[PDB]
Write a structure and sequence with these properties.
The complex is a heterodimer of chains A (about 550) and B (about 400). Chain A has about 550 residues and is of the alpha+beta class. Chain A has 14 helices and 23 strands. Chain A has 5 domains: about 130 residues, Roll (HIV Type 1 Reverse Transcriptase, Chain A, domain 1); about 90 residues, Reverse transcriptase/Diguanylate cyclase domain (Alpha-Beta Plaits, 2-Layer Sandwich), CATH 3.30.70; about 90 residues, Alpha-Beta Plaits; about 110 residues, Alpha-Beta Plaits (2-Layer Sandwich), CATH 3.30.70.270; about 130 residues, 2-Layer Sandwich (Nucleotidyltransferase, domain 5). In chain A, a hairpin with a 6-residue loop joins strand 18 and strand 19. The radius of gyration of chain A is 34 Å and the shape is elongated. Chain B folds into 4 domains: about 130 residues, HIV Type 1 Reverse Transcriptase, Chain A, domain 1; about 100 residues, Alpha-Beta Plaits (2-Layer Sandwich), CATH 3.30.70.270; about 80 residues, Alpha-Beta Plaits (2-Layer Sandwich), CATH 3.30.70.270; about 100 residues, Reverse transcriptase/Diguanylate cyclase domain (Alpha-Beta Plaits, 2-Layer Sandwich), CATH 3.30.70.270. In chain B, strands 12-11-10-13-14 form a 5-stranded mixed beta sheet, with helices on one face. In chain B, helix 3 runs parallel beside helix 4 and helix 6 packs antiparallel against helix 7. The longest helix of chain B is centred in the middle third of the chain and has 20 residues. The chains are: A alpha+beta (about 550), B alpha+beta (about 400). The interface between A and B is large, with 78 and 68 residues. The structure holds ligand CXD and magnesium ion. Magnesium ion binds next to strand 18 of chain A. Ligand CXD binds next to strand 4, strand 7, strand 8 and strand 9 of chain A. Chain B: This is p51 RT. It is classed as hydrolase. The entry lists the keywords hydrolase, nnrti.
Chain lengths: ~550, ~400
């Protein structure tokens, strides 16, 4: 049948302190026993396996199946137990190539390696551990015993050892053909040159022949696939790429399963179709669920879906990468914590697009989110292209400047430029650096009982006002925010607020514009309406005037 | 040379740490360097039967690229070897010297072969762009730079090398930490620099070649917590002061606020001025004295990890504290003068260097920055050959204001 590479083997070991597998072979039907004898006989003839005596004490179960439509039998070895006992290997690949990272070539050839694993030899000292037995008709006589000489299907080490073997084999050819790109992925090679067809089709043959010298067979000119290449949910054309066609089902009743599969397809489409959204559709999935259970679409979900269909109605494509030019990345706010981006080198021919829609924490603002989005895109660009892009952001240099200099975390956007693409990113309020003269000073406080969960929130002011609301099923944290909320509700357009909650101060000093907490959102609403707010902290239970009084006031009935 | 056998701490396997993505520039720089190290026999290509990995980076330190391997994991997992079995004792005298010069002696390690059974644990990967190729895998055949085992092993050879120099200059302190020699004298700076050049010549005969040239550790003194001084004091100002004083009392014993709080009594407007009574005036003055002196009761414990916290103060200013127990500050300081990340990495390096000099240990940093931002950018400005442990925190709010 097929060659087995003369490449050197990779030495392989069991996990220290472990012996090979000794799993009992279950009796099989005559039908199955016969199929396996014919298969293994053929495999032995081809070099793939070899007969061994009963001296070897190792065993792994063997099975055989044949679909009800078919007449071809297949052998199945269950390497579960050997796989436990086989050393860890180096992971195959950190990631997979993104089409957007491919440099365009005049000619591209795909070469799949035939019977990849069976074409590579296995460490002779390790073969013994791959032993299996075709049992006798009713397990009366000793079975027929074999071991693998090549990399078995389903064994832990085959992917890594194959790739390793392919790398060593390719090396010399690379060193003599530096202009030719050869991508390694699973059994495949993707080979690209800028040569004219004639000199390319020649170089493919020199490679195919070089590969054959090392026992690896590949398809010839007639059997080699043609563009567009359909690969991993992508279409790769000669001067553009896109995602394989997306079928958005129509349904009366949407099941969890149907929505999961829809979100997945939309997420997949988002890498080249700009503006895709999944927020509202994702909201439907955050629950008890159950695959077959129908979930009715909310109005927002229906509108989101409708907008995506519009986006998807006409085909969109991306271009390939030109490493002589810079990368430009643009980001737009889509609202409700959704961001969308596009990366091009020539406006506006996108290499790719994407989205960012991640809550980091409970309370945040658009400036923080934008920075996070920039960071994600930057990492992505280093992975795909090996360099960071220049950014175009919908935030004034002045807004960014004010924010970063005053904020307590280190933060740094690399080279960027402002672009007037509304909505623009702004901070919606700022806290005063100093006390407001002629403004009422509210001393606020909250308290919660741990057993009962009852709470009181309230304030006393320097103008003699007071108030105290009672709260049920609450916490200390919540009462402290309520207290601040009260003071904002009952105050004029200017106000000084004094709290002993580091928790509340910390939230509010970061100028959040959105929160998971309803209370925090209400506090934000107020802070925007105010003309000036100065917020200060004092330590609790030190009898500081103003604080001691509202403390007595809110402790009554709740704590000593 | 006979190789020193190295065994991992029982129950621990070697490092399986993933390579952070690298820019093309750095990948290309690493490929040159590694190609050359291969020819020289320092490293060899490995196969997939090695499941280990340690990240690698490229830095400038100069305009020449340098390979920096992140052995933080291998270091944790090999701690018994380099700290207990073959520990390098740290001299208390180093910090007392007027001048300390830091010399890179990392090349020394490349002439000493590494135990063959340990080599596999020094595996690393040069990645490629867009996962084009599988990426180039190597291990070390010689003592690698960045691994704490290397100086532990080379210790006996370094002693021979330095013996004449030490004998001839018995008041000079020389300390090895990782890839560097720290050399301290009390000499006039010209004389100091001359003895350093002299030392270079000794090293040269064994084939070896945020901070000024020298360090001046005897001119390191504390950052007192400082209380403002004013003519007029508002309610707000006293509140601020009491908050500052309050927290300060957890560190310093004897800090008192009774009198100051007495002024604030009632529900007073923040802007309203409050003349200080004489008792308060004096209470304030007493605290002020306490803060200028060191903390009684706080001592370095060699069995414990050091911790460093850093605060961004604005205008290119950063404060820091080093401790083992919270509030038991062993050292506090300030760093000043780019962008935030650049400044932070400068501060981290300076603080670590002082930490090596004072205790012979790097601290674990609590860094006020987003993990990914840090991870993307830190290598752009990093120039040390070691890397400290770090984690990521949220600083706020008044821990900031309580310093500077
Ligand atoms: N199938 C497949 C496949 C997958 C990948 Cl990741 C790459 C691949 O080959 C390409 C290579 Cl090696 C370089 C560039 C590209 C992008 N396409 C072209 O340059 C091109 N030129 C003419 N026809 C086409 Cl298509 C590859 F597809 C082919
Ligand atoms: Mg309280």
């Amino acid at each position: 049948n097929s060659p087995i590479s003369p490449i050197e083997t990779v030495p392989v070991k069991l996990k220290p302190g472990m012996d090979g597998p000794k799993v009992k072979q279950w009796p099989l039907t005559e039908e199955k026993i016969k199929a396996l004898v014919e298969i293994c006989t053929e495999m032995e003839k081809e070099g793939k396996i070899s007969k061994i005596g009963p001296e070897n004490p190792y065993n792994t179960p063997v099975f055989a199946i044949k679909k009800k439509d078919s007449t071809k039998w297949r052998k199945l070895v269950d390497f579960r137990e050997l796989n436990k006992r086989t050393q860890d290997f180096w992971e195959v690949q950190l990631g997979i190539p993104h089409p957007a990272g491919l440099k365009k070539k005049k000619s591209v050839t795909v070469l799949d390696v035939g019977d990849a694993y069976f074409s590579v030899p296995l460490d002779e000292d390790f073969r013994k551990y791959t032993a299996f037995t075709i049992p006798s008709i009713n397990n009366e006589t000793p079975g027929i015993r074999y071991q693998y000489n090549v990399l078995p299907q389903g064994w832990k080490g085959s992917p890594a050892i194959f790739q390793s073997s392919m790398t060593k084999i390719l090396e010399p050819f690379r060193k003599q053909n530096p202009d030719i790109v050869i991508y390694q992925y699973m059994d495949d090679l993707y080979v690209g040159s800028d040569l004219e067809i004639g000199q390319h089709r020649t170089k493919i043959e020199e490679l195919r022949q070089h590969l054959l010298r090392w026992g690896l067979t590949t398809p010839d000119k007639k059997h080699q696939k043609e563009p567009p290449f359909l690969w991993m949910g992508y279409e790769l054309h000669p001067d553009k790429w896109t995602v394989q066609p997306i079928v958005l089902p129509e349904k009366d009743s949407w099941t969890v399963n149907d929505i999961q599969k829809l979100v997945g397809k939309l997420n997949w489409a988002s890498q080249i179709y700009p503006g895709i959204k999944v927020r509202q559709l994702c909201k439907l999935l955050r629950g008890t669920k159950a695959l077959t259970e129908v979930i009715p679409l909310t109005e927002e979900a229906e509108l989101e879906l409708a907008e995506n269909r519009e986006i998807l109605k006409e085909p969109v494509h991306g271009v390939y990468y030109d490493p002589s030019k810079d990368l430009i990345a643009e980001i737009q706010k889509q609202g409700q914590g959704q961001w969308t981006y596009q990366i091009y080198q020539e406006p506006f021919k996108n290499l790719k697009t994407g989205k960012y829609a991640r809550m980091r924490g409970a309370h945040t603002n658009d400036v923080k989110q934008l920075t996070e989005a920039v960071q994600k895109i930057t990492t992505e660009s280093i992975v795909i292209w090996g360099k960071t892009p220049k950014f175009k952001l919908p935030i004034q240099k002045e807004t960014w400047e004010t924010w970063w200099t005053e904020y307590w975390q280190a933060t740094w956007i690399p080279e960027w430029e402002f672009v007037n693409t509304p909505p623009l990113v702004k901070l919606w309020y700022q806290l005063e650096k100093e006390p407001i003269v002629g403004a009422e000073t509210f001393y606020v406080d909250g308290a919660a009982n741990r057993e009962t969960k009852l709470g009181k929130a309230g304030y006393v002011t320097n103008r003699g006002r007071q108030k105290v609301v009672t709260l049920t099923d609450t916490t200390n944290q919540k009462t402290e925010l309520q207290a601040i909320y009260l003071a904002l509700q009952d105050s004029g357009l200017e106000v000084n607020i004094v709290t002993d909650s580091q928790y509340a101060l910390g939230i509010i000093q970061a100028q959040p514009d959105q929160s998971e907490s309803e209370l925090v959102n209400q506090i934000i609403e107020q802070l925007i309406k105010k003309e000036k707010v100065y917020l200060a902290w004092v330590p609790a239970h030190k009898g500081i005037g103003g604080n001691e009084q509202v403390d007595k006031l809110v402790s009554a009935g709740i704590r000593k | 040379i006979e190789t020193v056998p190295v065994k991992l701490k029982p129950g621990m396997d070697g490092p399986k740490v993933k390579q952070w993505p690298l820019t093309e520039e750095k990948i290309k720089a690493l490929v040159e360097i590694c190609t050359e190290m291969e020819k020289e026999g320092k490293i060899s290509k490995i196969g997939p039967e090695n499941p280990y990995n340690t990240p690698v980076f490229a830095i400038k330190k100069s305009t020449k690229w340098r390979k920096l391997v992140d052995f933080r994991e291998l270091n944790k997992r090999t701690q018994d070897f380099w700290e207990v079995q073959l520990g390098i004792p740290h001299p208390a005298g180093l910090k007392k010297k007027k001048s300390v010069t830091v010399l890179d002696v990392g090349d020394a390690y490349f002439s000493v072969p590494l135990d063959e059974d340990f080599r596999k644990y020094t595996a690393f990967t040069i990645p490629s762009i867009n996962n084009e190729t599988p990426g180039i895998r190597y291990q070390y055949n010689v003592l690698p730079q960045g691994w704490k085992g290397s100086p532990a092993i080379f210790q006996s050879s370094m002693t021979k090398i330095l013996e004449p120099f030490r004998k001839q200059n018995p008041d000079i302190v020389i300390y090895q930490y990782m890839d560097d020699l720290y050399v301290g004298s009390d000499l006039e700076i010209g004389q100091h620099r001359t003895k350093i050049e002299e030392l270079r010549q000794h090293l040269l005969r064994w084939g070896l070649t945020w901070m000024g040239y020298e360090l001046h550790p005897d001119k390191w003194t504390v950052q007192p917590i400082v209380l403002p001084e004013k003519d007029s004091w508002t309610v707000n100002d006293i509140q601020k002061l009491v908050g500052k004083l309050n927290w300060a009392s957890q560190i310093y014993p004897g800090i008192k606020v009774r009198q100051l709080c007495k002024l604030l009594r009632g529900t007073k407007a923040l802007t309203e001025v409050i003349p200080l009574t004489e008792e308060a005036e004096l209470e304030l003055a007493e605290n002020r004295e306490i803060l200028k002196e060191p903390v009684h009761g706080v001592y370095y414990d060699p069995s414990k990890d050091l911790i460093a916290e850093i605060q961004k103060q604005g205008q290119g200013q950063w404060t820091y504290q080093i401790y083992q127990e919270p509030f038991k500050n062993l050292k506090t300081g300030k760093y000043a003068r780019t962008n935030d990340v650049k400044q932070l990495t400068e501060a981290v390096q300076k603080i670590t260097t002082e930490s090596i000099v004072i205790w012979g240990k790097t601290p674990k940093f609590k860094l006020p920055i987003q993990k990914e931002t840090w991870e993307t950018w830190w290598t752009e400005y990093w120039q040390a050959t070691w890397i400290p442990e770090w984690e990521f925190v949220n600083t706020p709010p008044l821990v900031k204001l309580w310093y500077q």
